[PDB]
């Protein structure tokens, strides 16, 4: 995703699903290659100690001054018509300048953005339609002209453009913080299990203090862990052992 040869236009932002692997987030938050590295409802350091069912890496390209529009509850052309984040977004946004790659002598026009739409996008909605936008009261019938415009437009990416107008590559990491079995964990190593003692336990990011005992609960093959009346964890399934 980060080392990708080519990126997608913001209107047709690519999505890569990450599952069933170990994520060494250090390589990102220790690297100096990134201008913007903004994590919402999560600290990157702690990601090493966490598991998730799925991760979504949404990749695209924008101009610099619009990078601020990649954030929860922002407005503008990008966040309205191209790529909308939810207000309760939990994840990271990484962005770095790509003037050396995405800009060329004479102007790179391969990268587009949606300029018109009848309504704002929903979070993680993808609109790749090319319908003629009816700006006025007259039906276009797929014919361009007065108040009938093509919804997309190119970015003017030249190496001499202002940093504001220079191309920036963007990657958005969203995590599936659901309670379900987690296939995307951090590098943190595991240890042996101690029973019948007061211990500080961490199971797949689920932290706590207590005494771990062999249970008699009739857990189902799929059930990961249990709760009591108070909405507190009461019993778990060993990630390494059934």
């Amino acid at each position, epitope marked *: 995703v980060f080392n990708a040869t080519r990126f997608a236009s913001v209107y047709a932002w690519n999505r890569k699903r990450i599952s069933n692997c170990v994520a060494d987030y250090s390589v990102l938050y220790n690297s100096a290659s990134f201008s913007t590295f903004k994590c919402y409802g999560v600290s990157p350091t702690k990601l090493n100690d966490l598991c998730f069912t799925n991760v979504y890496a949404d990749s695209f390209v924008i101009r610099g001054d619009e990078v601020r529009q990649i954030a929860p509850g922002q407005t503008g052309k990008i966040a309205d018509y191209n790529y909308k984040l939810p207000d309760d977004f939990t994840g990271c946004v990484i962005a770095w300048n790509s003037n050396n790659l995405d800009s060329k002598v*004479g*102007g790179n*026009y*391969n990268y*587009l953005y949606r*300029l*018109f739409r009848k309504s704002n996008l929903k979070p993680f909605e993808r609109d790749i339609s*090319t319908e*003629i*936008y009816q700006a006025g009261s007259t039906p276009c019938n*797929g*014919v*361009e*002209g007065f108040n009938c*415009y*093509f*919804p*997309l*437009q*190119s970015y003017g990416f030249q190496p001499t453009n202002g940093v504001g107008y220079q191309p920036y590559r963007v990657v958005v990491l969203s995590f599936e913080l659901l309670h379900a079995p987690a296939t995307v964990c951090g590098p943190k190593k595991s240890t042996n299990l101690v029973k019948n003692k007061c211990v500080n336990f961490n199971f797949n990011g689920l932290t706590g203090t207590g005494v771990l005992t062999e249970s008699n609960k009739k857990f189902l093959p799929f059930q990961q862990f249990g709760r009591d009346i108070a909405d507190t964890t009461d019993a778990v399934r060993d990630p390494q052992t059934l």
Partner: nanobody
């Protein structure tokens, strides 16, 4: 990337000719194709443009009702059907291509294009 023009040549006034322009080489994307013309000693002048997506066309006033621009996406070819030829139509005709997508079709009349064909002579006789 090359633009290879063909067709045209000599035709008597009132007749019809078709110009072709084939795009060869690896293209990332095409936004629009256009035809321009240059009569001897005169400035090169816009004739017609077509958006690759959707196929909406924009015409110079001088050719409206007479010329039709069309596109075959699969063949990566643009055509100019030149009907009701007049002496005024005598010129070298140039194919042009751009990857620049404007929301506004009329921009293709004045946009500086990135790629140009070699030019094809059209001569209209009496």
């Amino acid at each position: 990337v090359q633009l290879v023009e063909s067709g045209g040549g000599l035709m008597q006034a009132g007749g019809s000719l078709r110009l072709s322009c084939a795009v060869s080489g690896r293209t990332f994307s095409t936004a629009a194709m256009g035809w321009f013309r240059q009569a001897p000693g005169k400035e090169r002048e816009f004739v017609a443009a077509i958006r690759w997506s959707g196929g909406s066309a924009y015409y110079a006033d001088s050719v409206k009702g007479r010329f039709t621009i069309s596109r075959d996406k699969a063949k990566n070819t643009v055509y100019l059907q030149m009907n009701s030829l007049k002496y005024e139509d005598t010129a070298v005709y140039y194919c042009a291509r751009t990857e620049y997508v404007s929301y506004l079709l009329s921009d293709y009349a004045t946009w500086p294009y990135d790629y140009w064909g070699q030019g094809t002579q059209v001569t209209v006789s009496s």
